[PDB]
Design an enzyme around this catalytic site. Sequence first.
Site, mmCIF file in Angstrom:
data_model
loop_
_atom_site.group_PDB
_atom_site.id
_atom_site.type_symbol
_atom_site.label_atom_id
_atom_site.label_comp_id
_atom_site.label_asym_id
_atom_site.label_seq_id
_atom_site.Cartn_x
_atom_site.Cartn_y
_atom_site.Cartn_z
ATOM 1 C CD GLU A 154 -62.128 -4.644 12.287
ATOM 2 O OE1 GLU A 154 -62.788 -3.654 12.180
ATOM 3 O OE2 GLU A 154 -62.618 -5.806 12.635
ATOM 4 C CG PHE B 56 -63.072 -1.402 7.530
ATOM 5 C CD1 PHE B 56 -63.224 -2.334 8.557
ATOM 6 C CD2 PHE B 56 -62.529 -1.785 6.305
ATOM 7 C CE1 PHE B 56 -62.886 -3.670 8.333
ATOM 8 C CE2 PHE B 56 -62.076 -3.091 6.114
ATOM 9 C CZ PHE B 56 -62.269 -4.030 7.134
ATOM 10 C CG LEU C 103 -71.259 -8.529 7.965
ATOM 11 C CD1 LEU C 103 -71.369 -9.621 9.027
ATOM 12 C CD2 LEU C 103 -72.247 -7.426 8.257
ATOM 13 C CG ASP D 248 -69.361 -8.624 14.372
ATOM 14 O OD1 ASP D 248 -69.458 -7.653 13.667
ATOM 15 O OD2 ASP D 248 -70.265 -8.909 15.249
ATOM 16 C CB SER E 229 -68.423 14.155 15.570
ATOM 17 O OG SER E 229 -69.430 13.524 16.313
ATOM 18 C CG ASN F 117 -70.225 15.180 19.204
ATOM 19 O OD1 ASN F 117 -70.511 14.322 18.343
ATOM 20 N ND2 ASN F 117 -71.166 15.683 19.976
#
Length: 162
Positions: free
Chosen positions: A11, A104, A32, A20, A117, A132
């Site tokens: 990040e 996250f 966020l 972002d 998946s 996948n």
Amino acid sequence: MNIFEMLRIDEGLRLKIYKDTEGYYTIGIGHLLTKSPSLNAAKSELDKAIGRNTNGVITKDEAEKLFNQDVDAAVRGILRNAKMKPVYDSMDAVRRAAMINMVFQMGETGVAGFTNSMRMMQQKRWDEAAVNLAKSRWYNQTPNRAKRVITTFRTGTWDAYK
Ligand SMILES: [Cl-]
Ligand SMILES: [Cl-]
């Protein structure tokens, strides 16, 4: 390598409000603030979260403080979710970290769309799951990150991050 370091790599760290990759107001290490277009709204969310009048800028310690909370909320969100928990419980430490990473970044909801998946993961079909996982907007929008995550799940090692 642990979840903290891994996410800090993916990040980054910024001490001033920024947009972002979806264009949303964020700060620190991937926190966020708001999906709203208003910068003022953001500043307001920001103050609420820090507990003070920031004027859009925070310190490193404050960022770290947000980050701990956020990692913690992510795990617990996992533990709380009936379809996720068992998947997560079935895995090893490294692969768990990869799932935390995805939660996250995209929220429980976001992660909840990878039903297929996740079955594969549960059955420990690593390579299939990895392919996948790649058939996703997620991978198409943030490919390098997706790639690191995916390898991690495919391999069960921290190689993509070393
Ligand atoms: Cl918060
Ligand atoms: Cl990326």
